């Protein structure tokens, strides 16, 4: 269970970046907005 609690080096910076561009994209502010918008206001 050593390696399940090791502490990250620079590369696994990377693999956190991923996974959060894959869920959210490049205009995911513009897409919520709207969203939100027409849901509530």
């Known amino acids: 269970f050593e ?3 090791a502490p990250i080096t ?5 693999a ?3 996974a959060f561009f894959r869920e959210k ?3 995911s502010q513009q897409l919520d907005s709207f969203n939100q918008f027409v ?3």
């Open 3 to 5: 390696d399940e609690s």
């Open 10 to 14: 620079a590369e696994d910076s990377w």
């Open 16 to 18: 956190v970046i991923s």
């Open 25 to 27: 994209g490049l205009v």
């Open 39 to 41: 849901d509530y206001t």
